[PDB]
């Protein structure tokens, strides 16, 4: 419909930890916005099954966070593998954005990309090599006019779709608060 090589692909992952070589993806969510950040479509929100041996690598922060959110129960009950999650996500993205055109968009999105390179390279390849990291703007704003940041707050639930919605909201806030274009 609104298919455009200017559209942006937003992605957030939840993982069993911070190390792509040791840990696994347990949730993924995608959103497509147009170039002006209007949300066009939300993609699959997928809890990815992992065995107990992989959930058992989670430290206290990860265990308590993902248990309290309900994600661990969803992971245990899920019948979706990484490969199937890639397939669902690509089938969604191909309807909205051409391959290789959108930077990867989110907060500290380089971390998600590391997990995509390791565990979902077919999906990593769908992105342009660049990064749209909303936290770049967060960090520059903290240094250049930190009182701006008290006008915006996040819930931070570590439910992947809600968190990527907050990433988009953060950039929308910066568009009005710190940009003049």
Q: Judged by CB, which is closer to Na ion: 12, or 170?
A: 12
* Rg value, the chain, Cα: 16
8 Å CB contact between 31 and 124: no
By CB under 5 A, name the one of 12, 124, 166, 170 that touches Na ion.
Answer: 12
Shortest separation between residue 124's beta carbon and Na ion, angstroms: 16
By CB under 5 A, tell whether 170 contacts Na ion: no
Q: Which is nearer to Na ion, 7 or 167 (CB)?
A: 167
Residues contacting residue 24 through CB under 8 Å, at least 6 positions apart: 15, 16, 48, 50, 54, 119
Q: Which stretch binds Na ion (CB under 5 A): 11-19, 38-46, 52-60, 127-135?
A: 11-19
Residue of 117, 129, 131, 174 marked active site: 129
Report d(CA 157, CA 30) in Å as an integer: 16
Q: From the CB of residue 33, how many other CB atoms can be counted at a distance below 10 Å?
A: 21
Smaller CB separation from Na ion, 3 or 18 = 18
Q: Is 129 a catalytic residue?
A: yes
Work out the number of other CB atoms within 10 angstroms of the CB of residue 151: 9
Residue pair 93/126 in contact (Cβ under 8 Å)? The answer is yes
Site residue total, Na ion (CB under 5 A): 1
Using CB under 5 A, which of the segments 7-15, 75-83, 115-123, 133-141 binds Na ion? Answer: 7-15
Catalytic residue set: 129
| Residue ranges in contact with Na ion by CB under 5 A | 12
């Amino acid at each position: 419909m609104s298919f455009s090589d200017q559209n942006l692909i937003w992605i957030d992952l939840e993982m069993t930890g911070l190390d792509p070589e040791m840990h696994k993806i347990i949730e993924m969510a995608t959103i497509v916005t147009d170039s002006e950040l209007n949300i066009l479509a939300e993609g699959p929100v997928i809890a990815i099954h992992q065995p107990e041996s992989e959930l058992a690598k989670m430290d206290e922060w990860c265990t308590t966070t993902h248990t309290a959110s309900g994600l661990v129960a969803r992971v245990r009950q899920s019948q979706v593998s990484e490969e199937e999650a890639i397939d669902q996500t690509l089938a969604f993205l191909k309807q909205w954005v051409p391959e290789g055109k959108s930077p990867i968009c989110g907060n500290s999105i380089g971390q998600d990309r590391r997990f995509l390179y390791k565990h979902m390279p077919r999906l990593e390849a769908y992105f342009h090599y660049r990064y749209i990291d909303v936290s770049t703007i967060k960090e520059l704003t903290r240094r250049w006019q930190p009182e701006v940041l008290k006008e915006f707050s996040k819930t931070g639930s570590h439910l992947a779709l809600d968190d990527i919605r907050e990433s988009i909201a953060e950039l929308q806030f910066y568009r009005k608060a710190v940009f003049k274009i």
